[PDB]
């Protein structure tokens, strides 16, 4: 028996845009040229690996989103006060 029965609700468009939106909060970049630089490919590959691990860690689409958004919350709001507190 396996509780996972939610993969059929997902789309390739959702997968693509959620990987993209993961990257936007993992590192917002200094300027839009920094999204195109070769070092951002490491950030992008890390975001792809995280997306797949959070997907595999979930028995529902809601739990998958919750796991994505909690790790996004950590990565964004930890650095926003450890490195950007003065805003």
């Amino acid at each position: 028996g396996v509780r996972k029965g939610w993969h059929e609700h997902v789309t390739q468009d959702l997968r693509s845009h959620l990987v993209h939106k993961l990257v936007q909060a993992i590192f917002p970049t200094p300027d839009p040229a920094a999204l195109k630089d070769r070092r951002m490919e490491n950030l992008v590959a890390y975001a792809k690996k995280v997306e797949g691990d959070m997907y595999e860690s979930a028995n529902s689409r809601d739990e998958y989103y919750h796991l994505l958004a909690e790790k996004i919350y950590k990565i964004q709001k930890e650095l926003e006060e450890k490195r950007r507190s003065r805003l």
Binding site: L14, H17, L18, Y65, A69, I72, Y73
Partner: peptide
């Protein structure tokens, strides 16, 4: 900190509504 927290939490979970909606239910 609250507006940007709800903003971050919503920013991901809105994507399925942006791409394929919820009017089917």
């Amino acid at each position: 900190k609250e507006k940007r927290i709800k903003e971050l939490e919503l920013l991901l979970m809105s994507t399925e509504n942006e791409l394929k909606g919820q009017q089917a239910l």
